[model samples]
Target: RFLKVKNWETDVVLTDTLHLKSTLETGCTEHICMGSIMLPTKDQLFPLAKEFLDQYYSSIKRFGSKAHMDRLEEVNKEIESTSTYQLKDTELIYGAKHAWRNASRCVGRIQWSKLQVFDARDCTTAHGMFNYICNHVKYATNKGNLRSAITIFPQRTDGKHDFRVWNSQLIRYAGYKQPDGSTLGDPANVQFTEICIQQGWKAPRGRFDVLPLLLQANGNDPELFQIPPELVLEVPIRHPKFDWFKDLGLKWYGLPAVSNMLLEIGGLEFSACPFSGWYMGTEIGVRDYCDNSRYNILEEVAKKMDLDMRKTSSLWKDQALVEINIAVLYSFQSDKVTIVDHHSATESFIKHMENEYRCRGGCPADWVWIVPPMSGSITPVFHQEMLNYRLTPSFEYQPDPWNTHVW
Candidate 1:
């Protein structure tokens, strides 16, 4: 039977029988679409644990081999005796790579196989988590020559003992709510910024202050640690032709590190894993700058460009969007930072899809996410139909620890 996904953006129903084998349950049904909602957390592990071991062995071309069978039996006994079992270092690395490979929302999966997986399971303290995170930032930034990397902290045990990173990103600007009812810096981080202040973090009250890390270990109260300025690599945004662009004082961190996703591998869940990749220019240029809830600089940029404000007929927003994108790409390249434009990134993703289909039966994807925010029609992925399904060894969202905080 063909599974159907409705593209609400285009009002088209796409069919996919190729990837209908997922045992994972999603909120979406055939009659209704819940593709926008988050996946539910898994509570039990038995069969899934066994399934992952099989996949791991198959990947190494050792399925049902003596060593593979022996390890599987050993794991079965261990899980039977205890609620959980530890993964080998090699298994952890492989699972991390597969999680990135199976991420439906990421456009940078072409570098999935090249990820540097840091196992920080040995770390016990919240301060120690900060130390590992600083090292991750330093290595991933690499002075603007960004590299794909992930640092995996200790896995959750007994459900109550969870390690978590309070920040959504490893590096992001703080949002300050002004008394006049406007926000300064990135407005998206307003709630998090308030939480930081409540936690006794000193607010710099600046437009681009990098927020400190709030790391929680073993479900304890989060401890705050300021990221060293030297470890943070940033680029000042300036246009190639416009002299006034630099006067706007726009800058963004080089590393796009996500700190608040739960990594599930072989039925085990890592509640605190922070992963980073280089920027895709439009992510900063279009979404960050133009989205009304974000910085919302379109009017400012359009005003600087002397575009007609009174008329949507003038397409002033479109023109301003293009220039900012141009500036983002130009500035990043001039600073020797790693970034991909929408066109190049989507083209490579098409290649990645082809490779995945040839090796496996199909590649799972969410069309609404795979397509870039700007120029949806121009990109190859926009026209391509996709099957949206969850895969094992995947990264999924967890409930924010603050919502259920004991202290």
Candidate 2:
């Protein structure tokens, strides 16, 4: 999925000088395909500082931001002379929010400003990262009431001391490759799951088992943690009307905390930024469980429902798809876990677009991602022509941990 981000980049970044983080970790002898990332940078560090300044001031320009602008003046003086770049509490917090608001592919950016940011910059050890991740999980999961949050670990401060989470998400299903060509679970995570086995961690053999937390410091040796079952919440999926669905025994974790993205603020890169938001029903229904490359359970459900298989007009796939989504929304709602159905989710997204249009003159959104995978044409988003472009202070797909981590 990360490799395909280019299909969604959509060229909204108005700056030609912008580049994917030029420096990449050539870890693991190059078999690894950690995804590429857009990190903040400048030809000279001064320009990057100004870029952040321009963005910061523009975000709250009406307030006569001279005081804040003045604060940047001295910071820039030392910035050119030193290896570190500093950010004010307000600036850092505001930039993170704006990044979310500006994430072109996200439909849930309505909660952008509400994201909780945790500064774990001083943390440089595997132990420190694990403690913080546990806290992040406990806080964001909120015992089924998910909250959007980001914990920024140490940035690249003169190399040899960087921190990164090897797991794709703090919570992810393990994909066990069987003797045949088929997979037992989420195929998207199969690669990372193998890395875990190589690093001395035992993986439970299951189609829906949650992968344990893996961390690495200085991009060197990886460490493992058996996440407490109490801190992790799993939702067992069952169709509301389809009693036979309970026999399928499918379940997913409560939180989607992405662990591989690089968080760049003002030219400094936090290579290991793990963040989370509540699930959208389709993310579970269409992409994770139904994507042909992942679980690919659509036809199985269609067959179980006794739908006609030979004809597209039968809408067998569509019917089963909706039921899958129904099961997801039903399961999450029944468990009091925070999840949004596509209907209300798209409506909220359009409202967010209008709000952004009135304030920023435009909302850059990707048509491909903004539209739900199924029944997309029926959604309001399908009717809207969205503008997609790159924006600074944004969360980006970084190199995949296994591929990009310097061994």
Best by TM-score: 1
Instruction: Pick the lDDT winner.
Output: 1
Model 2: runs farther than 4 Å from truth? 1-43, 58-66
In candidate 2 the C-alpha lDDT for residue 96 amounts to 73
Residue 267 of model 2, lDDT score: 69
Task: In candidate 2, list every pair of residues with a backbone clash.
Answer: 12-389, 12-390, 13-390, 27-407, 34-400, 35-399, 35-400
Residue 180's lDDT within candidate 1 is 96
Per-model CA lDDT versus the true structure: 0.88, 0.77
Task: Report the lDDT tens digits of candidate 1 across residue range 57-173.
Answer: 998999989999899888877887877889999999999999998898887888889999999999999989999999999999988888899999999888777899999999999
lDDT of 2 at 111: 85
